[PDB]
Design an enzyme around this catalytic site. Structure first.
Site, PDB file in Angstrom:
ATOM      1  NE  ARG A 237      46.540  47.370  44.625  1.00  0.00           N
ATOM      2  CZ  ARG A 237      45.667  46.446  44.233  1.00  0.00           C
ATOM      3  NH1 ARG A 237      44.628  46.134  44.993  1.00  0.00           N
ATOM      4  NH2 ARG A 237      45.833  45.829  43.068  1.00  0.00           N
ATOM      5  CD  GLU A 266      47.921  43.018  50.239  1.00  0.00           C
ATOM      6  OE1 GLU A 266      46.991  43.779  50.577  1.00  0.00           O
ATOM      7  OE2 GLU A 266      47.749  41.991  49.554  1.00  0.00           O
ATOM      8  CG  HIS A 292      44.642  41.308  48.230  1.00  0.00           C
ATOM      9  ND1 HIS A 292      45.705  42.134  47.951  1.00  0.00           N
ATOM     10  CD2 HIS A 292      43.744  41.497  47.233  1.00  0.00           C
ATOM     11  CE1 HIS A 292      45.468  42.789  46.829  1.00  0.00           C
ATOM     12  NE2 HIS A 292      44.284  42.423  46.374  1.00  0.00           N
TER      13      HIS A 292
END
Ligand SMILES: NC(=O)c1ccc[n+]([C@@H]2O[C@H](COP(=O)([O-])OP(=O)(O)OC[C@H]3O[C@@H](n4cnc5c(N)ncnc54)[C@H](OP(=O)(O)O)[C@@H]3O)[C@@H](O)[C@H]2O)c1
Ligand SMILES: NC(=O)c1ccc[n+]([C@@H]2O[C@H](COP(=O)([O-])OP(=O)(O)OC[C@H]3O[C@@H](n4cnc5c(N)ncnc54)[C@H](OP(=O)(O)O)[C@@H]3O)[C@@H](O)[C@H]2O)c1
Lengths: 328, 329
Positions: A237, A266, A292
């Site tokens: 992440r 995000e 991603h």
């Protein structure tokens, strides 16, 4: 009156056919992401939701959708979904525990190699039509004889370690809890302190979820400890790192490179979420980026959708979904 | 009077320091490749040459340099060096047998992942400033559950096989001589015919030297067999493939992708080599290219230069270089 299922993003026809006899389908068979407002409107009287990466479910969302019985997530990292709130409201939250692991680990290793070897600039040079043969240029960093440090040693950490077995590297990791001895010994993994990981690794591969404890874990303080020239790869992440601190480390030449498949922009659950990736980070020569696409392997995406769909059907049939993140 | 050594490309200062006590050094400490005319000018009265991938030594070259006693190549594939002419003229030719293997294998697997996952276009997209979170583009092919075929199973083939052990792929290969059973079994490698290799592999990784038998081996006939979407990776020599046949297979959408570190235009010994890579091949989206950077790992290049230097010094001392490719009186 079949229970209503809201599917926020496009799904394979096979999945609609699977769900159709059991659900009224409120679908989004487009290539677009809908607004939070529109998603909330659709879910108002829904009994189920199939959620994807751009989705965010907070306590307020759940309160406005009192009939929701299950949120079936087509992903692994459920940081944008309030699990505690789901549990309090008697709502199942489900994920996809394994299917995303290997595609992401493959990409992470590809990024490590690409970053170390200047793949971006190398390809640009050849594609320019200016290639005239070998030059004493583009010298980079390989995995052979290097120390590779893993931060986190769950599914992806393990999968990356598996994939580096023939590569002549010294493998080390930091985790909250020790890996079982047999797995450690099989993979040739040595457990080290987080600071030691950053101080002694030539490649650092992140394999952590995003939560309160890991938010901005890779900060200026920790980056100040890295071996000059170390390469950092982030397939987990964005907000596990402080991207501003990463950029600063690159610009001062302490960090040798940053490769990422994920970005702070995000992480919707953050009220102070960055709205973009810093253009100066994007422009830095010592970087390599992907949008991603960790689990963007063609065969796998149908299987992921199917996993989420099966979990939703279990919950609607009054069963405990096999991949429930919570217990009711 | 010290022997004169011509070093055609930039080397680490440490290597200059190693050689200077024994040789008059005629260096090229720049990033440029000099003309063959200039290299000939420098080598006319030289006793030694440290040669690199851009160099080409033929009969004519050797005739023009009658004092040459050793050509120390900082490379493994010496296809652009006429070893037969060296041997006939009493000139040692030396190479670097192992150091280039591992970094080239690492790159090839990097290219396999990069090509399969549209890394080139993916990076270009993110850098545009237009990234808006998870999206539907750039779905690709992974190694997990895929068949990976190796053509050739020497140093680089084996190094690639070693590095794919934990990747969940079905590994197969074609070679003129099969590996022994214990190695095949440990590595999970199955030997297949060349035609079967091309018809049944999702990824095809080339691991061959360039010679008379392998020139244009990967031609239209072989490419016509591949599974729709099959990915081809060439880290060995450009001319092992027919790049025109590759381009045609890409354009029809039969070949899913071509990644290469090496190109036909580099193969100087071929009189009929192309002078560039086809602009149309460079323009094709299903490609990933690197400029012969297979062994471009900083620490490894230092050791490669050291090896060439040590071999040259041995020859100038009157002994057989440890990595001599030929045999002399
Ligand atoms: N790029 C992509 O497309 C993609 C795909 C899949 C996943 N991801 C992301 O990557 C993350 C990791 O994936 P995964 O499948 O490996 O998840 P996982 O199997 O849950 O592994 C995560 C590991 O990190 C450990 N951990 C948690 N907090 C830690 C801390 N503060 N310090 C050290 N270790 C800590 C956990 O250990 P404990 O069990 O002790 O907590 C767990 O073993 C996911 O949560 C998701 O956000 C991205
Ligand atoms: N991109 C780079 O920077 C880079 C770096 C290093 C090397 N390379 C290139 O890659 C090539 C391979 O490297 P390597 O280290 O693996 O060399 P190697 O150890 O000599 O292996 C080459 C293998 O190919 C086999 N072979 C030869 N002719 C064949 C044919 N006609 N059909 C099938 N197999 C054949 C050989 O077996 P036999 O004994 O049966 O002939 C040998 O096992 C080198 O020659 C060089 O051109 C490129």
């Amino acid at each position: 009156m079949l229970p209503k299922l809201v599917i926020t993003h496009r799904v394979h026809e096979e999945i609609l056919q699977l769900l159709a006899p059991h659900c009224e389908l409120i679908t989004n068979q487009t290539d677009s992401t809908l607004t939070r407002e529109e998603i909330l409107r659709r879910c108002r009287d829904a009994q189920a939701m199939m959620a994807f990466m751009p989705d965010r479910v907070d306590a307020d969302f759940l309160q406005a959708c009192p009939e929701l019985r299950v949120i079936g997530c087509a992903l692994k990292g459920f940081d944008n979904f309030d699990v505690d709130a789901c549990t309090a409201r008697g709502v199942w939250l489900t994920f996809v525990p394994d299917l995303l692991t290997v595609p992401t680990a493959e990409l992470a290793i590809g990024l490590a190699v690409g970053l170390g070897r200047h793949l971006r600039a190398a390809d640009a040079f050849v594609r320019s039509g200016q290639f005239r043969g070998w030059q004493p240029r583009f010298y980079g960093t390989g995995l052979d004889n290097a120390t590779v440090g893993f931060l986190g040693m769950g599914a992806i950490g393990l999968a990356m370690a598996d994939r580096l077995q023939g590569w002549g590297a010294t493998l080390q990791y930091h985790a909250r809890k020790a890996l079982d001895t047999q797995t450690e010994q099989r993979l040739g993994l040595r457990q080290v302190a987080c600071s030691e990981l950053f101080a002694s690794s030539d490649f650092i591969l992140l394999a952590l979820p995003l939560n309160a404890d890991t938010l901005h874990l890779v900060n200026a303080e920790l980056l100040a400890l890295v071996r000059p020239g170390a390469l950092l790869v982030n397939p987990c992440r964005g907000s596990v790192v402080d991207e501003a601190a990463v950029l600063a480390a690159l610009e001062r030449g302490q960090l040798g490179g940053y490769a990422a498949d994920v970005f702070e922009m995000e992480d919707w659950a953050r009220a102070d979420r960055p709205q973009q990736i810093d253009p100066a980070l994007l422009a830095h020569p010592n970087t390599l980026f992907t949008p991603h696409i960790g689990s963007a392997v063609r065969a796998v995406r149908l299987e992921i959708e199917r996993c989420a769909a099966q979990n939703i059907l279990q919950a609607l049939a009054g069963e405990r979904p096999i991949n429930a993140v919570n217990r009711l």
